Amino acid sequence: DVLEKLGEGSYGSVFKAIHVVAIKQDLQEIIKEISIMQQCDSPYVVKYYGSYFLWIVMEYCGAGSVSDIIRLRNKTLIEDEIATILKSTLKGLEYLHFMRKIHRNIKAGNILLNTEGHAKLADFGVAVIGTPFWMAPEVIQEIGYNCVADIWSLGITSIEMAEGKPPYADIHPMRAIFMIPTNPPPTFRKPELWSDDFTDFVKKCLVKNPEQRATATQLLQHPFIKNAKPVSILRDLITEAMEIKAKRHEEQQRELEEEENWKVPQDGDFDFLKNLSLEELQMRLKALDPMMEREIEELRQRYTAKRQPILDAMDAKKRRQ
Amino acid sequence: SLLVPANPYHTAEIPDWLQVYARAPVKYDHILKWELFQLADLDTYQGMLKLLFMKELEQIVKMYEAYRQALLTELENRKQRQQWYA
Ligand SMILES: Nc1ncnc2c1ncn2[C@@H]1O[C@H](COP(=O)(O)OP(=O)(O)NP(=O)(O)O)[C@@H](O)[C@H]1O
Ligand SMILES: [Mg+2]
């Protein structure tokens, strides 16, 4: 199958597809990993289907991640928006911990929203060292860890939603590895902006000692989560993002079929040039070369594609011989 | 001395189904399995695709050379039309 782009910004590209679904881009272990990701059946968790023999197939969430929505609108999320998402995030995080799984990732980018506004967790069995902003101290220190390692990440994530960046974002990541276990828990950069319910929730998430760190189920009973509103409050920001996403898709294809009228008139008749203004004549002469290399490029890129399966076939035969 | 021969395909007629395979879309491309062909008859096909790409690319360049001259000719007429006014 084959449909358009969605992004990357981490490992490889992730694509949309219709068969609607989404797809992401040592083998016997990979196979049993997806095989267990399929056993998950929760409305608070992105469903995994199969893995094309690595290419992965997963449920399609139309509103994207809360990270994309933050970047597209250029706005951080308010408090009700966070609480509503975190409630649905905490559910399903409770579920993975029920099935003695640990998400181990968790970040604004892996919290996906469907058009209805339902938040769903993604990317657990798809994660010499990498970026450790959302990692808990014990995960960094390679001490043992349990299910509440996700709760730390959840606190970091809620700060990410509120300020647009995790703590230590501007610092070199390799410095953060050693500051996170030592330095006290992060807090808000402007605490006065945030309520007592939110700051306390993040305070209960970011307990350095894991044995004194709240669990998923316990946090579902926190004031910040009880005052959480229905999923219906995310409708306006989801409409804002989808319109911004759509308006640049129109600008992209309106600027694409705009270049279509600089190519050579197909009938080969150039008598009409008598009707153009000198300036329009200059513009076509100028655009002539950039448009010829475009047509030529799209000609070789088509023909080397039609011509390759032939060459690839002749190659397998020579090996057999 | 050594004599390399002219391209053998300039004279050999090109089957129409292969011109369809070239005009085909980006999508329908693996539709056809080539393993059944023999190694040598398959050589006689990828070479005709080059020859088609050439006939197709020559037409592109000629069109732009004509459009280039048409533009430059007319631009010379606007120049000469102008001088004749002043
Ligand atoms: N199921 C999905 N539906 C819609 N968009 C998706 C889906 N999965 C991933 N995406 C998009 O893919 C983008 C990049 O995801 P990804 O390549 O996983 O990098 P990342 O999520 O930011 N970090 P990581 O999850 O650790 O690889 C996100 O911003 C999403 O918008
Ligand atoms: Mg992701």
Residue numbers in the entry:
A (entry chain A): 28 to 46, 52 to 57, 63 to 90, 95 to 168, 181 to 313, 428 to 488
B (entry chain B): 291 to 376
From the reporting publication:
In mammals, the canonical Hippo pathway contains a core kinase cascade, formed by STE20-like MST1/2 kinases, Large Tumor Suppressor LATS1/2 kinases, the WW-domain containing scaffold protein Salvador (SAV1) and the adaptor protein MOB1. MST1/2 contain an N-terminal kinase domain and a C-terminal coiled-coil SARAH domain, which are separated by a flexible linker. MST1 and MST2 can each form a constitutive homodimer through the SARAH domain, and kinase activation is achieved by trans-autophosphorylation of the activation loop (T183 for MST1 and T180 for MST2). In this study, using a combination of biochemical, structural, and cell biological experiments, we establish the PP2A complex, STRIPAKSLMAP, as a key negative regulator of Hippo signaling in human cells, and show that SAV1 promotes MST1/2 activation through antagonizing the STRIPAKSLMAP PP2A phosphatase activity.
To understand how SAV1 activates MST2, we determined the crystal structure of MST2 ∆L/D146N bound to the SARAH domain of SAV1 (residues 291–383). Surprisingly, MST2–SAV1 does not form an expected heterotetramer through a four-helix bundle formed by their SARAH domains. Instead, SAV1 SARAH and MST2 SARAH form a heterodimer, similar to that formed by the SARAH domains of MST2 and one of the RASSF family of tumor suppressors, RASSF5. The active site of MST2 in MST2–SAV1 is well-defined. The Mg2+ ion and AMP-PNP are clearly visible in the electron-density map. The SARAH domains of MST2 and SAV1 form a long antiparallel coiled coil and do not directly contact the kinase domain. The N-terminal extension of SAV1 SARAH forms two short helices, H0 and H1, which interact with the main coiled coil through several hydrophobic interactions. Furthermore, the SAV1- and RASSF5-binding surfaces of MST2 SARAH are virtually identical, readily explaining mutually exclusive binding of SAV1 and RASSF5 to MST2.
